[PDB]
RNA sequence: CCAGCCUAAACCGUCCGGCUUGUCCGGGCGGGGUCGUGGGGCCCUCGGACACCGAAUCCCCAGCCUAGCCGAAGCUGUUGGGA
């Protein structure tokens, strides 16, 4: 089974990672304890919009950084 | 006997709800779409259109069913209880 976890559980990996576990761990512990949410296609898309979000934003501000980099220098 | 159609899905607007407010997930609605020479979506170009196509839907009517009316032409005698 696949899932997207919301807590760095010293068993699988840090949050966000989309790690595999058997139905049980995720059907009767990890889902109800909201430790991780179920991994449908829908959600994997939610992932990208977020990553890219700050990806470009960190590069974009970065760009603006160089602007001041030159005029201040 | 005759007959073919609408949709789910990619996408866009919108309202609302959620939440690690995202250039987003979902739910409702609308737009979009319905195919086997495969189709649809998205961008570009063509002119994109007055045109075509047209209901199993709707209104009017005929006809029609539910009571009915017109409807031609004969008399005499004879048997017989009675023609």
CA A45 – CA A7 distance, rounded (Å): 19
Please count the residues of chain A: 73
**Token pair of A22 as six digits:** 């058997």
- Say yes or no: Cβ of A27 under 7 A from any atom of strand B: no
Question: Which helix H or strand E contains A47, and what residues bound it?
Answer: helix A41-72
Asked if residue A42 keeps its beta carbon closer than 7 A to nucleic acid strand B, the reply is: yes
Final resolution, Å: 3.8
Which residues are paired to A37 by β-bridges? A4
Among positive and negative, which fits the CA dihedral A36, A41, A43, A46? positive
Q: Which of A42, A36, A33 is nearest to A18 (CA)?
A: A36
Containing A3, the helix (H) or strand (E) segment is strand A3-5
Q: Which two tokens stand for residue A52?
A: 């890219």
Residue A30: CB atoms within 10 Å: 23
Burial (0-12, 13-18, 19+ Cβ within 10 Å), A38: middle
Specify the experimental method: X-ray
């Amino acid at each position: 089974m696949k899932v997207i976890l919301l807590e760095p559980l010293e068993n699988l990996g840090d949050v966000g990672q989309v790690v595999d576990v058997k139905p049980g761990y995720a059907r009767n512990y990890l889902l109800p304890r909201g430790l991780a949410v179920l991994a449908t296609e829908s959600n994997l898309k939610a992932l990208e919009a977020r990553i890219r979000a700050q990806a470009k934003r960190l590069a974009e501000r970065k760009a603006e950084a160089e602007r001041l980099k030159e005029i201040l220098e």
